[PDB]
Amino acid sequence: MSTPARRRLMRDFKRLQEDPPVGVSGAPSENNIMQWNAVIFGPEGTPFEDGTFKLVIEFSEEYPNKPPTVRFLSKMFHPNVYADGSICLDILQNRWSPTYDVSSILTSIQSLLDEPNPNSPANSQAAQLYQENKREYEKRVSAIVEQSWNDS
């Protein structure tokens, strides 16, 4: 049966694919469509600049009516980001609105690496090591960005 959800996401896809952003991409799964797979690099000047990170966008049938949740498929270290591979971002909670598009969703997560949101220390460890052991932070980011290159 025709599903309006499915139709919306395939339109959104077509829009993103005719009008693509830079330093992020996103596409659906191969067979599933409630689950998209998306990618980000660090912008210039970040400790992440070379390294590439892999995400999934998790949608609902009441879409974009509910916030599209996001997961991190790859290991991620950031104070806004769970070990559980999820994103605390305030617009992805009660502050969402059906105005943000697939580019907008991803470009936020890119700039979030350059500028974390200290109003929400999701994993107090990451925020702790920022104030405490910034040199360990620098180590871990080189290591986590390095893990990107595990296929060569």
Q: What is the CATH classification number for the domain harbouring 25?
A: 3.10.110.10
Is-contact 88 69, C-beta < 8 A?
no
DSSP H/E element including 24: strand 24-28
How far apart are alpha carbons 143 and 121 in whole angstroms? 22
- Domain limits at 72? 1-152
CB neighbour burial string for 35-58, b if at least 16 within 10 angstroms, e if fewer: ebbbbbbbbeebbbeebebbbbbe
Active site members: 88
Q: Quote the number of domains for the chain.
A: 1
Using CA atoms, how far apart are residues 76 and 82, in angstroms rounded to an integer? 8
